[PDB]
């Protein structure tokens, strides 16, 4: 019931910029705590 993975933070691609426009257009906030 446990396993650790190491990953470097990538950088937001400029290609996926229209992907951020549809996001903000559809971004629907959710609670961090349920």
């Amino acid at each position: 019931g446990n396993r650790v993975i190491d990953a470097e933070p990538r950088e937001i691609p400029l290609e996926y910029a229209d992907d951020l426009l549809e996001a903000m257009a559809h971004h629907r906030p959710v609670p961090c705590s349920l």
């Binding site: 950088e11 549809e22 559809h26 971004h27 961090c32 705590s33």
Partner: protein, 124 residues
């Protein structure tokens, strides 16, 4: 102190998965009752963390801790997310130099493994 994170969702789940699928290490397979921690160090050239994730058929527990460099801070508490119906995403502001612990908790699932599609970012 420590800044609260923002967390949201968006419906383009089939689109998101197809982009992520193309990468080998951006897709985890969390097993029955398994908990996969993803250690994401702060980028020395960065000030914020972002995350995107999703799964295919079932939900999965998700939360985020922060390890100082064993002192921990609960950034996002681990609750189950319906990341199989919409793409789950969020951001948080670096409090200092440390390692973000992205918890993908499946401990509650006795029979189902979860195929996680995720990707992490940073901004200067």
């Amino acid at each position: 102190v420590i800044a609260a994170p923002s967390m949201w969702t968006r419906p383009q789940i089939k689109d998101f998965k197809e982009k992520i699928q193309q990468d080998a290490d951006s897709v985890i397979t969390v097993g029955r009752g398994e908990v996969v921690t993803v250690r994401v160090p702060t980028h020395e050239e960065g000030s914020y963390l972002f995350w995107e994730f999703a799964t295919d058929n079932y939900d999965i527990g998700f939360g985020v801790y922060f390890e100082w460099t064993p002192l921990l801070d609960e950034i996002v508490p681990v609750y189950r997310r319906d990341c199989h119906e919409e793409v789950y995403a969020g951001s948080h502001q670096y409090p200092g130099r440390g390692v973000y612990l992205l918890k993908f908790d499946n401990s509650y699932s006795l029979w189902r493994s979860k195929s996680v599609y995720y990707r992490v970012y940073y901004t200067r």
